[PDB]
Design a protein around this motif. Sequence first.
Motif, PDB file in Angstrom:
ATOM      1  N   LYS A   4       3.152   1.099  -2.401  1.00  0.00           N
ATOM      2  CA  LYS A   4       3.884   2.360  -3.534  1.00  0.00           C
ATOM      3  C   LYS A   4       2.937   3.502  -4.539  1.00  0.00           C
ATOM      4  N   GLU A   5       1.496   2.974  -4.773  1.00  0.00           N
ATOM      5  CA  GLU A   5       0.088   3.231  -4.991  1.00  0.00           C
ATOM      6  C   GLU A   5      -0.858   4.193  -4.205  1.00  0.00           C
ATOM      7  N   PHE A   6      -0.538   3.547  -3.043  1.00  0.00           N
ATOM      8  CA  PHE A   6      -1.194   3.346  -1.972  1.00  0.00           C
ATOM      9  C   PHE A   6      -0.895   4.930  -2.129  1.00  0.00           C
ATOM     10  N   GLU A   7       0.622   5.650  -1.618  1.00  0.00           N
ATOM     11  CA  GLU A   7       1.163   6.421  -1.346  1.00  0.00           C
ATOM     12  C   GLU A   7       0.879   7.669  -2.701  1.00  0.00           C
ATOM     13  N   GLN A   8       0.842   6.800  -3.448  1.00  0.00           N
ATOM     14  CA  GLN A   8       0.717   8.186  -4.819  1.00  0.00           C
ATOM     15  C   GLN A   8      -0.690   8.294  -4.776  1.00  0.00           C
ATOM     16  N   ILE A   9      -1.872   8.082  -4.633  1.00  0.00           N
ATOM     17  CA  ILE A   9      -3.204   8.162  -4.644  1.00  0.00           C
ATOM     18  C   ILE A   9      -3.500   9.072  -3.601  1.00  0.00           C
ATOM     19  N   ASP A  10      -3.058   8.969  -2.323  1.00  0.00           N
ATOM     20  CA  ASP A  10      -2.957   9.814  -1.493  1.00  0.00           C
ATOM     21  C   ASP A  10      -2.464  11.244  -1.686  1.00  0.00           C
ATOM     22  N   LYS A  11      -1.351  11.755  -2.107  1.00  0.00           N
ATOM     23  CA  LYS A  11      -0.386  12.769  -2.649  1.00  0.00           C
ATOM     24  C   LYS A  11      -1.308  13.170  -3.620  1.00  0.00           C
ATOM     25  N   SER A  12      -1.838  12.780  -4.233  1.00  0.00           N
ATOM     26  CA  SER A  12      -2.517  13.290  -5.589  1.00  0.00           C
ATOM     27  C   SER A  12      -3.554  13.012  -4.797  1.00  0.00           C
ATOM     28  N   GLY A  13      -4.304  13.656  -3.547  1.00  0.00           N
ATOM     29  CA  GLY A  13      -5.898  13.245  -3.195  1.00  0.00           C
ATOM     30  C   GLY A  13      -6.640  12.846  -4.227  1.00  0.00           C
ATOM     31  N   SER A  14      -6.588  11.415  -5.217  1.00  0.00           N
ATOM     32  CA  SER A  14      -7.673  11.131  -5.806  1.00  0.00           C
ATOM     33  C   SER A  14      -8.245   9.917  -5.576  1.00  0.00           C
ATOM     34  N   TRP A  15      -8.008   9.244  -4.578  1.00  0.00           N
ATOM     35  CA  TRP A  15      -9.182   8.447  -4.234  1.00  0.00           C
ATOM     36  C   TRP A  15     -11.192   8.531  -4.305  1.00  0.00           C
ATOM     37  N   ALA A  16     -11.161  10.353  -4.639  1.00  0.00           N
ATOM     38  CA  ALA A  16     -12.737   9.895  -5.155  1.00  0.00           C
ATOM     39  C   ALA A  16     -12.306   9.659  -6.266  1.00  0.00           C
ATOM     40  N   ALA A  17     -11.830   9.981  -7.204  1.00  0.00           N
ATOM     41  CA  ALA A  17     -10.921   9.654  -9.038  1.00  0.00           C
ATOM     42  C   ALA A  17     -11.269   8.512  -9.151  1.00  0.00           C
ATOM     43  N   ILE A  18     -10.453   7.312  -8.085  1.00  0.00           N
ATOM     44  CA  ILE A  18     -10.112   6.343  -8.392  1.00  0.00           C
ATOM     45  C   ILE A  18     -11.672   5.983  -8.513  1.00  0.00           C
ATOM     46  N   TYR A  19     -12.012   5.692  -6.902  1.00  0.00           N
ATOM     47  CA  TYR A  19     -13.354   4.643  -6.349  1.00  0.00           C
ATOM     48  C   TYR A  19     -14.731   5.498  -7.694  1.00  0.00           C
ATOM     49  N   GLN A  20     -14.555   6.985  -8.393  1.00  0.00           N
ATOM     50  CA  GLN A  20     -15.979   6.512  -9.333  1.00  0.00           C
ATOM     51  C   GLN A  20     -14.993   5.579 -10.315  1.00  0.00           C
ATOM     52  N   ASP A  21     -14.023   5.431 -11.133  1.00  0.00           N
ATOM     53  CA  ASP A  21     -13.419   4.429 -11.872  1.00  0.00           C
ATOM     54  C   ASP A  21     -14.032   3.748 -11.751  1.00  0.00           C
ATOM     55  N   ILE A  22     -13.752   2.912 -11.139  1.00  0.00           N
ATOM     56  CA  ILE A  22     -14.159   1.690 -10.186  1.00  0.00           C
ATOM     57  C   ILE A  22     -15.622   1.469 -10.222  1.00  0.00           C
ATOM     58  N   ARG A  23     -16.272   2.490 -10.547  1.00  0.00           N
ATOM     59  CA  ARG A  23     -17.872   2.478 -10.462  1.00  0.00           C
ATOM     60  C   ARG A  23     -18.229   2.707 -12.051  1.00  0.00           C
ATOM     61  N   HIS A  24     -16.954   3.529 -12.369  1.00  0.00           N
ATOM     62  CA  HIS A  24     -17.797   3.249 -14.028  1.00  0.00           C
ATOM     63  C   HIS A  24     -17.159   2.231 -14.635  1.00  0.00           C
ATOM     64  N   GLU A  25     -16.340   1.563 -14.159  1.00  0.00           N
ATOM     65  CA  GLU A  25     -15.532   0.012 -15.205  1.00  0.00           C
ATOM     66  C   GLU A  25     -16.504  -1.245 -14.254  1.00  0.00           C
ATOM     67  N   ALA A  26     -17.696  -1.067 -13.770  1.00  0.00           N
ATOM     68  CA  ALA A  26     -17.672  -2.604 -12.533  1.00  0.00           C
ATOM     69  C   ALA A  26     -19.013  -3.111 -13.684  1.00  0.00           C
ATOM     70  N   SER A  27     -19.248  -4.168 -13.772  1.00  0.00           N
ATOM     71  CA  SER A  27     -19.834  -4.880 -14.124  1.00  0.00           C
ATOM     72  C   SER A  27     -21.556  -3.957 -14.037  1.00  0.00           C
TER      73      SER A  27
END
Length: 297
Positions: A4-27
């Motif tokens: 359900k989240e995968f489809e949401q991200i795809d529709k938003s075209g937000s994979w780059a933003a999601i991925y950068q969020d992980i980069r910013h939060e990473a240890s």
Amino acid sequence: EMEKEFEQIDKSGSWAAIYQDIRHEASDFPCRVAKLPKNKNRNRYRDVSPFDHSRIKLHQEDNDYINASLIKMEEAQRSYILTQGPLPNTCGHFWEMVWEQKSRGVVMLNRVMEKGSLKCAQYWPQKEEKEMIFEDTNLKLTLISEDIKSYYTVRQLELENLTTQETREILHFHYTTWADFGVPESPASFLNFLFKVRESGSLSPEHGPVVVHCSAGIGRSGTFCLADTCLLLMDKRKDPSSVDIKKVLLEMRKFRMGLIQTADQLRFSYLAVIEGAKFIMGDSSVQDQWKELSHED
């Protein structure tokens, strides 16, 4: 639901933003040993180092450093060692690590030569009759057999501690068509390969942690480990909805920096876990379908 989240991200075209969020939060933990002057020629990439707290130590008095990290997934109860492609001067260290950590399998996700450049030393013998001796660590390595498929090769190696004459069988799982900063040809091809590693016993708790490497040991290596851990977690209570892929990746990144190097690798990781869930949730026949779709010969 990851779907359900995968489809949401795809529709938003937000994979780059999601991925950068992980980069910013990473240890962010120190890598002081990796940055010591005496270890400069033990690191393949200036910007990929093991954290001090999770690094694998070699059992030797001289210099215990290797660019390798123990990723210990507590809840899933699986461990992996992630490491860079061995350098010409660290092949002995690499096999010392395999011996001391009691690993049964090595997963190699890169080719020795990629994009016209050398990404990894030739750290295993290509011919039965030409075995390798690593004099610095007193190990002998012999190619026993090889099973060559269309996009991967499985090798049986014999590793011998020359000091004690103890010998061990090492399985080498070599994915040969996965480009650095790329994704596998399909979920089916990747999962067929992952289940081959699983089926061999190399990931099982009676052995040491599997060794996983690509060139730097974070991108393709991260994708492999994330999908495997996510599927194992789902297995433990048959509950796909309890698996939060982004939080699993962040947990892994507590043990090694930079795991999963592109947003499309993250996106692929979702695809692989979603498809693999069919097997976990009781459709055993999907494994056969992966093997056919993979065209392995």
